[PDB]
Amino acid sequence: EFRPGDKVVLPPYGVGVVAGIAQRSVSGVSRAYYQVDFPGSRSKAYVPVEAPHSVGLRKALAPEEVPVILDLLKNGRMPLPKQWAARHRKTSEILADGNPYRIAQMAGQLRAWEVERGLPDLDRQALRRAIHLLAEEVAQSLEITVQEAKRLFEEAWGEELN
């Protein structure tokens, strides 16, 4: 399961922490809910203990994963459709899925293209979004500010970020 204090992610609602497990009884069966607090949005989510995998609740990046995520962002390559619409579909699916490894690998590809020959607006939006998601999760994992996290991205990004 998830233990209280566990750092987690719930796409696309950002990073959070598991408060604990509350049991409620309805019609004589007691269901167990996770409470997850999202400080970034001052929100909460109550997630049935049988449901994490089904709704996308996952463990957040552990601090030691950060270096491998960044090296991935740096060397990340993957085929993408040349047709703008099919490509935007693909990038949206990856972002929505919200996996940090898939997202890093995709951003790696988009970033390489950007530096080589620039990017269309839709592709820029996807790339920006990818970096937003990774930075906030990295920031939480290392308990630093998003601004401080972005600094860590310089090598992989090939330049300083804004």
In angstroms, what CA-CA distances link 162 with 41, 53, 75? 22, 34, 21
Contacts of 80 (CB under 8 A, 6+ apart): 87, 90, 91, 106, 109
Domain 1-59 bears CATH identifier 2.40.10.170 = yes
Tokens of 8: 């987690």
Domain ranges across the chain: 1-59, 60-161
- Give CATH for domain 60-161: 1.20.58.1290
* Half-sphere CA count of 47, side-chain side, radius 13 A: 26
Please state how this structure was obtained: X-ray
For residues 154, 68, 79, 58, the Cα torsion angle rounded to the nearest 10 degrees is -110
Taking the C-alpha atoms of residue 91 and residue 106, their distance in angstroms, rounded to an integer, is 8
Rg of the chain over all Cα atoms, to the nearest angstrom: 18
Domains 1-59 and 60-161 equal at CATH topology level: no
Taking the C-alpha atoms of residue 35 and residue 16, their distance in angstroms, rounded to an integer, is 10
Q: Which element (helix H / strand E) includes 74?
A: helix 66-75
In angstroms, what CA-CA distances link 160 with 69, 81, 97, 128, 152? 17, 28, 27, 14, 9
**Segments of 56-149 assigned E as strands:** 58-59
Q: Are 68 and 102 in contact (CB under 8 A)?
A: no
In angstroms, what CA-CA distances link 65 with 25, 37, 75? 39, 23, 16
